[PDB]
């Protein structure tokens, strides 16, 4: 893989709770991605295991849908239960079954162990930037997602797009390492780490978070 | 480092004097707060809000609610007294004659305009537009809040939580009638309407009286009447232009509005605090817990909300005392500046 560092540009804001508020400025304190943070752009062409530190913000502008899932865990072997999310052309499947994958896990397009959880749903993935936030809180693997019509693939847009929670999985496993999945018969994705931050969220009349202020970014935002 | 002012050295000597050879007429503006918003608080609905258990636990805390209501009622009466003693200083509602010739002086931007529904002058309309004053829920705030609007209002939240704004006794039309009567009496009689019955006198003669009052011979006015009238008209036009462009001159009245809005907003936001309880929702407490533990949590909430209400009442009492001092100053200025000519410097 090839690593290039870049800026967040006020990305990664999500809905902190399932409560409707409209035309109000609400102060929340949670694991957020700080504004103008240092995110890493990975280029993988046909792969060390990445850390999972206080949640991961993941982003991809790949229209080819080569990226098709995630693997989470501690050691990613048969000894430790490893979560696996796989998105094929019909559904999405989430399983805690460990496959005992190799050091470079991938999927073959051209035509196990202990199993305690399984969840099947509709495809997460349909010039379109897809954003996800994964965080483990109190034995919950909370996932937030968003889709955005992007203009430039290389350029992370300057704007706001609140992430909405997809699922609330009570997996309750110890996660410190993770990796992505590629489909083989090229890929480029952005990874960032969340931190405990206090945010000021602005709701419009429709209850949508249209703006946010990071209180600890600089003295001006602290004054705000 | 801040600059105190330009340096000056008066050319003083024991056989030299400086005497002016010309003059100018200045029209300055002084803004004084008189009365603030009259408010009333339903302590039972604020603290408990339709909860019999909370009300019965509140009954054991004595006469705190009654004395808070008494203090707020005293403030509300004091505001009307301030407005009455400031504006209602003329016994008869004078009106100006249909003719509008006062020796070249205009008095067109301060005399009322009958075309508008409220008989307020141009400058009064400019002031009312420049002060961003809320309606304060006068005309049926609950009926307005009953309309299903997707955006909840802060006034609606205050009304639902039990903080009500009472309307003033004297309407703005009545205040404008007082000011119009005072203006007409001043223009048509001078100071004589402040010490008995109004005595008519031409405005040139009245200004000659004023000139003799400030120690200047009246022939100065009778020989510079046109220049003085032009200077007065230009100063009035400059007042109009300053009011129609800069909106920061009314900061005192804007602060009077803002403080009374912010106090109610803080009092409403203080209902979401826990004060060491398990929840800030009384019905949630009563549904989760049994009698004794619910009583303990409700007592914690009651103590917190009672302390918040007492803080609000104390702050309003101090603010009302300050406003009363300002209103007394405004009444004295109406008695001496308007009803007569003042020899007091500055």
């Amino acid at each position: 893989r090839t690593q290039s560092y870049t800026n967040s540009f006020t990305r990664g804001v999500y809905y902190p709770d399932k409560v409707f508020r409209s035309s109000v400025l609400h102060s929340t304190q949670d694991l957020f991605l700080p504004f103008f943070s240092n995110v890493t752009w990975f280029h993988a062409i046909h792969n060390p295991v990445l850390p999972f530190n206080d949640g991961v913000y993941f982003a991809s502008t790949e229209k080819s849908n080569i990226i098709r899932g995630w693997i989470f865990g501690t050691t990613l072997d048969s000894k430790t239960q490893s979560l696996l999310i796989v998105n094929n052309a019909t559904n999405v499947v989430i399983k805690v079954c460990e496959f005992q994958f190799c050091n470079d896990p991938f999927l073959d397009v051209y035509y196990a162990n202990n199993c305690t959880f399984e969840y099947v749903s509709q495809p997460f993935l349909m010039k379109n930037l897809r954003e996800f936030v994964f965080k483990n809180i109190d034995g919950y693997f909370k996932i937030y997602s968003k889709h955005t019509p992007i203009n430039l693939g290389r350029d992370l847009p300057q704007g706001f797009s609140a992430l909405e929670p997809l699922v609330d999985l009570p997996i309750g496993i110890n996660i410190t390492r993770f990796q992505t999945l590629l489909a083989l018969h090229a890929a480029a994705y952005y990874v960032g780490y969340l931190q405990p931050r206090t945010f000021l969220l602005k709701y419009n009349e429709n209850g949508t978070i249209t703006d946010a202020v990071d209180c600890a970014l600089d003295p001006l935002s602290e004054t705000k | 480092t801040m600059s105190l002012g330009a340096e000056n050295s008066v050319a003083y000597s024991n056989n030299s004097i400086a005497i002016p050879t010309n003059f100018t007429i200045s029209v300055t503006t002084e803004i004084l707060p008189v009365s603030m918003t009259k408010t009333s608080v339903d302590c039972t609905m604020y603290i408990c809000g339709d909860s019999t258990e909370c009300s019965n636990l509140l009954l054991q805390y004595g006469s705190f609610c009654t004395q808070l209501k008494r203090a707020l009622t005293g403030i509300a009466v004091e505001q009307d007294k301030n407005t009455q003693e400031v504006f209602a200083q003329v016994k008869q509602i004078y009106k100006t004659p249909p003719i509008k010739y006062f020796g070249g002086f205009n008095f067109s931007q301060i005399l009322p305009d009958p075309s508008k529904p409220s008989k307020r002058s141009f400058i009064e309309d400019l002031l009312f537009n420049k002060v961003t004053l809320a309606d304060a829920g006068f005309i049926k705030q609950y009926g307005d809040c009953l309309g299903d609007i997707a955006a909840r209002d802060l006034i609606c939240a205050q009304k639902f939580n039990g903080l009500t704004v009472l309307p003033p006794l004297l309407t703005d039309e009545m205040i404008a009638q007082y000011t119009s009567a005072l203006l007409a009496g001043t223009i048509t009689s001078g100071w004589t309407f402040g010490a008995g019955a109004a005595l008519q006198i031409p405005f040139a003669m009245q200004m000659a009286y004023r000139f003799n009052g400030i120690g200047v011979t009246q022939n100065v006015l009778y020989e510079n009447q046109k220049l003085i009238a032009n200077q007065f008209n230009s100063a009035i036009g400059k007042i109009q232009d300053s009011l129609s462009s800069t909106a920061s001159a009314l900061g005192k009245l804007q602060d009077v509005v803002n403080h009374n809005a912010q106090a109610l907003n803080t009092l409403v936001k203080q209902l979401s605090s826990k004060f060491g309880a398990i929840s800030s929702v009384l019905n949630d407490i009563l549904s989760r817990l049994d009698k004794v533990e619910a009583e303990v949590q409700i007592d914690r909430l009651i103590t917190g909300r009672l302390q918040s209400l007492q803080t609000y009442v104390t702050q309003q009492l101090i603010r009302a005392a300050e406003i009363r001092a300002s209103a007394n100053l405004a009444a004295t200025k109406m008695s001496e500046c308007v009803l007569g000519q003042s020899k007091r410097v500055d």
Partner: protein, 370 residues
């Protein structure tokens, strides 16, 4: 009665306010039909050890919490955040039942904010815990002559335990400088030690079976709700309402709030519920408190007369819940008992917005407003 006097001076006095009373009650719970399997939790042949405590997820069932007294012989039902009596009224999203067996000395360690060997290496409870702990003696089940070494607990660990975190690894704990490398000797301790349970020990060392029921106060749709039946939906009427254990009083109106599909409740500035989602039919209802307002009594002196007018402050005259035949609409409220006259006098008893009332002749004495 308000003035604590038998003589009332002339003026206007603020008397106690008025409320529009609710008509009936509405109960609205989700449509579920199953029963929660507490038999598998309580009537079990063997509970797992504390270091490997069993966890069961309970969802999509009707929970009857007064039935649990028959299954196990315990004295009380200790709960943090809730009360055992009210458990059948409010209902939760998910329930989690944890089961293990400990000693009698370590029962007090199963509580929020508690530290110790068990609470630090085997089972740690969150400090914001909202649930119940059940513990009962099992000396006739978990004790055998010569020792019941089938129960284990952890004595050694490098770090503590996060809330609701389970450790299963059996590795050689190194208490010294030299590495152990799979050899238990000298300062190389096996962390798992066995409870030696004998029937001849005292009651303080006897085994105790513990079941912890943790409730979830989430904002997701509730799946575990009690046996309380649900009634029909009444709108545009001042009623009491009970939505998924959320009790209140007001008027439910059809709303146009654009709720996102994951949002259930809506909140106000004072953190009170403003819009709810009906669990049976997924529609959004606004909640508005029933009509109220201030009440003032306008009277002359009792030395003169006993006739009284009443000003309803903040109420439109068409919205009065109900009283003389003279009803007048003022900008301060609705005045009942004073007939408005077209004349104008000095202000005798002020009301607001230029209105004053007085006890005056008519022909013959009555209260007039002007």
């Amino acid at each position: 009665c308000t003035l604590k006097s038998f003589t009332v001076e002339k003026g206007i006095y603020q008397t106690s306010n008025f409320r529009v009373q609710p008509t009936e009650s509405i109960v609205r719970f989700p449509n579920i039909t199953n029963l929660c399997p507490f038999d598998e939790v309580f009537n079990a042949t063997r509970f797992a050890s504390v270091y490997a405590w069993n966890r069961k997820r309970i969802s999509n069932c009707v929970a009857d919490y007064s039935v649990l007294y028959n299954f196990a012989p315990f004295f009380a039902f200790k709960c943090y955040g809730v009360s055992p009596t009210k458990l059948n009224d409010l209902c939760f999203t998910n329930v989690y039942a944890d089961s293990f067996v400990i000693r009698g000395n370590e029962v007090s360690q199963i509580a929020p904010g508690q530290t110790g060997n068990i609470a630090d290496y085997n089972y740690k409870l969150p400090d914001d815990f909202t649930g119940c702990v059940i513990a009962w003696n099992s000396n006739k089940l978990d004790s055998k002559v010569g020792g019941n070494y089938n129960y284990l607990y952890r004595l050694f660990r490098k770090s503590n335990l996060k809330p609701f975190e389970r450790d299963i690894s059996t590795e050689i704990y190194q208490a010294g400088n030299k590495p152990c490398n799979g050899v238990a000797g000298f300062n190389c301790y096996f962390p798992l030690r066995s409870y030696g349970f004998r029937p001849t020990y005292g009651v303080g060392h006897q085994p105790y079976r513990v079941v912890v029921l943790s409730f979830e106060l989430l904002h997701a749709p509730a799946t575990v709700c009690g046996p309380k039946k649900s009634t029909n939906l009444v709108k545009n009427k001042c009623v009491n309402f009970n939505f998924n254990g959320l009790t209140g009083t007001g008027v439910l109106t059809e709303s146009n709030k654009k709720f996102l599909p994951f949002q259930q409740f809506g909140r106000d500035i004072a953190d009170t519920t403003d819009a709810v989602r009906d669990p049976q039919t997924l529609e959004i209802l606004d909640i508005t408190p029933c009509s109220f307002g201030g009440v003032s009594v306008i009277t002359p002196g009792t030395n003169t007369s006993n006739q009284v007018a009443v000003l309803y402050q903040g109420v439109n005259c068409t919205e009065v819940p109900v009283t003389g035949s003279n009803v007048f609409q003022t900008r301060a409220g609705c005045l009942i008992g004073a007939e408005y006259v077209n004349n104008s006098y000095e202000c005798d008893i002020p009301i607001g917005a230029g209105i004053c009332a007085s006890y005056q002749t008519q022909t013959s004495q009555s209260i007039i407003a002007y």
